[PDB]
Design a protein around this nucleic acid. Structure first.
Ligand SMILES: [Mg+2]
Ligand SMILES: [Mg+2]
Ligand SMILES: [Mg+2]
Ligand SMILES: [Mg+2]
Ligand SMILES: [Mg+2]
Ligand SMILES: [Mg+2]
Ligand SMILES: [Mg+2]
Ligand SMILES: [Mg+2]
Ligand SMILES: [Mg+2]
Ligand SMILES: [Mg+2]
Ligand SMILES: [Mg+2]
Ligand SMILES: [Mg+2]
Ligand SMILES: [Mg+2]
Lengths: 157, 207, 49, 259
RNA sequence: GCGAAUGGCUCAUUAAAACAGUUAUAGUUUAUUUGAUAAUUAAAGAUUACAUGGAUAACCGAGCUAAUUGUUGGGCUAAUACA
RNA sequence: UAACUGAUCGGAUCGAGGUUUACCUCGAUAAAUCAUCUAAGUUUCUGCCCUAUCAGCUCUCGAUGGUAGUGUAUUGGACUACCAUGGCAGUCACGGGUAACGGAGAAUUAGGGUUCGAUUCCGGAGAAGGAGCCUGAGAAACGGCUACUACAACUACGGUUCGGCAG
């Protein structure tokens, strides 16, 4: 009644079981879409016993992950199940023979399963284009503490 | 040349974005194809109309413009018969599509219980016509009629909502097919989770 | 108005020049392939269609 | 771009063809076939510049168009100026009953190996993909774009088969595993032949492999570039330029002019 | 029936755009080629399969305009066209 | 397994060489699906010259994300509707200049650098400017078409052009 309607006008799964399950009145009916992107990645416990209907998830959908895999710090928590990760790298300068600092910002999609927080390191995978920016989904989240400015924070992670 | 190139946009940082390429033909964008219903030939004689469009590879893609009959499946029973759709209600996407009884992939509609009624009768010995005459079996109980029982006893507890539906002649179901893409209109019969829910949208919608 | 009159049945191709105005007056405001009553040509065309 | 390319430039045509730089301006562009553009040798190249049976361009035009049929590729007739003869193929020159192996050098140039009516029978096939198709049936596919029906089941995807052309029959296969012999179809290391050491898969999208050989050199290349020339040390075909092993510019000198 | 969407010229536009070096297509289309695969022709209809049906260029002949690889208009027969 | 459409396919075609029969042998070509080759869309990451006498930019319609649909060859706010308010920035956003198409490379060079790359390779863009489209497996083609702006050629001034040399 909550996870289902909640504003939006319906939220099923990829494997349209449900209502039909009432046919198997004895074993386990409460099926949800289960998956495992593999690639050396554990599938979130929370992902399984959730009521969430996120088609853009890498464990609850026919969303693949291929090639490019990222690790970066998180900037913002706003946006619906989407986050911006900031990567901090050095650039070399041919002439002066030294480096300068630089940061690329990245649009990342977050399946409800893992719980966000601002200023923590995150691991993204290469998933098909989900929107103008998005092209990365979160696969493994590590909580971390930064006392204040996320901008000030710059780590060659 | 209604294109869909992502160039006429503004990069992340909303700054306008350059162009050196005239609209290129592979960015094709075909004219939308609203899809109505002939469950009211008050004007509309030609029941269903489907126009085929020459697509890329060289294939054809049939486009549904006007319809009246689609195919639907009862999840639970695994039955599927072609039936006449009735009126479109609640399109979610927008209420105007309902106002023009347009057919979106996921538009919730009504159908004729006839094929399902006809079937539920033959396989269980239960017509579903007004409750009292409920069952209709055979005179002698020695032979194969012993099965309509076995099935009937399968506590065919078809939700109190599924039952009312039949008798009323109307049946709730959502669609699962792009008319503007394949020309057809196929849907599943509404039940449990969504049934209860979509109905609510309808109860509260009118009240 | 000059006429290129063809005769199916045999394969007769003939050309007639009709200068006087009064005769042709019947072809005016008639559609393509209509039925012509070639009696507005009392000459050689006595009772033709 | 306008549509699909359709020509090829002297300058741009692969160094494997040991081509004439001054030559002309173009070069026979391989026809869409069994082997990829870069990995192939169009007949015109094969006879004119290679064998030298042909010469001027029209010379070919005769040979492959003449109602006699002078060229055979894997037991079949061919009459296309640029049929892409690829790796591990067998080409027969009718009018002389010549039989050749389409194999790369040790320096990566397409070489023509002369075969005896014996090897001319079998051809080595590498396994592309393996899956079951229509009505419960198993299918295997070879680099040579061969599609196989009902193949022996003890065959993993990255296998190497011996093919009896005469009977279009298979015999003695051999997967790639620690301890075999191999030929590398392309790379900074092509034309080499050694003993597989071990295959470290990295799944992230690209597995690698190591190798040893005669002078016990250490070789490194991606699996896609390994072709199993044989099982357990014994190679299956005669190699060009002696054994599939290249020399230091230093070893070449000492062998030739003995420095 | 294919080809004409290769090539050939040019750089006016165009600063993360295009490009390059990289990667993905489990988000896709590809005529021509190479390998392979098909026992059942759907219902209603209709029905010959030793195999069906109708029409039109070229051609014959009449014609228009000052004018162009313009084209009207009548008669004749074939297809891997069409049906 | 259930049913839907039936505009998917399942050859009404063509050679030649043989040979006392019953035919035989090697080919052409049409065409469906899977591969395959070829190429193309779109895509990840990283990298560009001057400039703040450019500091706040994008958001009335998309600017950032979520929902459902359209649409496409397919992904996608690519477009519609509803919802959230985000997305970028001094680690220079946004805007402006460029006698700026980017590379491969070119000229001089102790080392480090300085200045160029219209121009045989590659990729891109375009064909008078601009938009639209037919056809096709394939182009917004352009030595194809439609209209507008500015033009080029013929005229019996009615009308016409297979009119675009950045080949
Ligand atoms: Mg510090
Ligand atoms: Mg096709
Ligand atoms: Mg060719
Ligand atoms: Mg892979
Ligand atoms: Mg970029
Ligand atoms: Mg005629
Ligand atoms: Mg004969
Ligand atoms: Mg969608
Ligand atoms: Mg600018
Ligand atoms: Mg420059
Ligand atoms: Mg060029
Ligand atoms: Mg490119
Ligand atoms: Mg000139």
């Amino acid at each position: 009644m909550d996870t289902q309607i909640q504003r939006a006008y319906q939220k099923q799964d990829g494997v349209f079981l449900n209502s039909k399950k009432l046919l198997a009145k004895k074993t386990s009916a409460g099926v949800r879409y289960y998956k495992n992107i593999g690639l050396g990645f554990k599938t979130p416990k929370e992902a399984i016993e959730g009521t969430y209907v996120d088609k853009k998830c890498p464990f609850t959908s026919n969303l693949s992950i291929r090639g490019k895999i990222i690790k970066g710090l998180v900037i913002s928590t706003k946006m619906n199940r989407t986050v911006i990760i900031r990567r901090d790298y050095l650039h070399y300068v041919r002439k002066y023979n030294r480096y300068e600092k630089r940061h690329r910002n990245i649009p990342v999609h977050i399946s409800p399963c893992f719980s966000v927080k601002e200023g923590d390191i995150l691991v993204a995978g290469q998933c098909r284009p989900i929107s103008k920016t998005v092209r990365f989904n979160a696969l493994q989240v590590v909580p971390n503490e930064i006392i204040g400015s996320v901008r000030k924070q710059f780590l060659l992670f | 040349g209604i294109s869909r190139d992502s160039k006429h946009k503004r990069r992340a940082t909303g700054g306008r974005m350059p162009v050196h390429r005239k609209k290129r033909a592979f960015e094709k964008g075909r004219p939308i194809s609203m899809t109505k219903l002939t469950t009211q030939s008050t004007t509309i004689t030609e029941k269903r109309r489907i126009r085929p469009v020459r697509v890329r590879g060289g294939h054809l893609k049939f486009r549904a413009l006007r319809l009246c009959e689609g195919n639907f499946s009862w999840g639970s029973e695994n039955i599927t018969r072609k039936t006449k759709i009735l009126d479109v209600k609640y399109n979610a996407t927008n209420n105007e599509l309902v106002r023009t009884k347009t057919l979106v992939k996921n538009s919730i509609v009504e159908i004729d219980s006839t094929p399902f009624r006809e079937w539920y009768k033959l396989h269980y010995g239960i017509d579903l016509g007004l409750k009292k005459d409920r069952t209709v079996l055979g005179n002698k109980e020695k032979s194969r009629h012993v099965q309509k029982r076995v099935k009937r006893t399968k506590a065919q507890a078809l939700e109190k909502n599924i039952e009312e539906q039949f008798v009323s002649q109307r049946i709730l179901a959502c669609i699962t097919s792009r008319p503007g893409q394949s020309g057809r209109a196929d849907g599943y019969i509404l039940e449990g989770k969504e049934l209860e829910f979509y109905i609510r949208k309808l109860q509260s919608k009118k009240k | 108005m000059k006429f290129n009159i063809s005769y199916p049945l045999t394969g007769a191709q003939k050309c007639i020049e009709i200068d006087d105005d009064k005769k042709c007056n019947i072809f005016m405001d008639k559609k393509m392939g209509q039925e012509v009553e070639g009696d507005t040509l009392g000459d050689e065309f006595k009772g033709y269609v | 771009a306008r549509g699909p390319k359709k020509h090829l430039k002297r300058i741009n045509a692969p160094k494997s063809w040991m081509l004439n730089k001054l030559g002309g301006i173009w070069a026979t562009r391989p026809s869409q076939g069994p082997h990829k553009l870069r990995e192939s040798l169009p007949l015109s190249v094969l006879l004119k510049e290679r064998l030298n049976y042909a010469l001027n361009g029209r010379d070919v035009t005769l040979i492959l168009n003449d109602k006699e049929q002078n060229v055979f590729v894997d037991g079949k007739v061919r009459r296309d100026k640029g049929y892409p003869t690829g790796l591990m193929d067998v080409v027969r020159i009718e009018k002389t009953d010549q039989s050749f192996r389409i194999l790369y050098d040790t320096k990566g140039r397409f070489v023509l190996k002369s075969l005896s009516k014996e090897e001319a029978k079998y051809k080595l096939l590498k396994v592309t993909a393996k899956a079951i198709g229509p009505n419960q049936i198993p299918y295997i596919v070879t680099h040579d774009s061969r599609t196989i029906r009902f193949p022996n089941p003890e065959i993993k995807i990255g296998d190497t088969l011996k093919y009896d052309l005469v009977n279009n029959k298979i015999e003695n296969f051999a997967h790639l595993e620690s301890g075999n012999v191999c030929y590398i179809q392309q790379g900074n290391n092509i034309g080499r032949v050694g003993i597989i050491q071990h295959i470290e898969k990295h799944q992230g999208s690209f597995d690698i492999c190591h190798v040893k050989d005669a002078k016990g050199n250490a070789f490194a290349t991606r699996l896609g570039n390994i072709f199993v020339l044989g099982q357990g040390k014994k190679s299956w075909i005669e190699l060009p330029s002696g054994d599939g092993v290249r020399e230091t510019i230093l070893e070449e000198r000492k062998r030739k002019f003995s420095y």
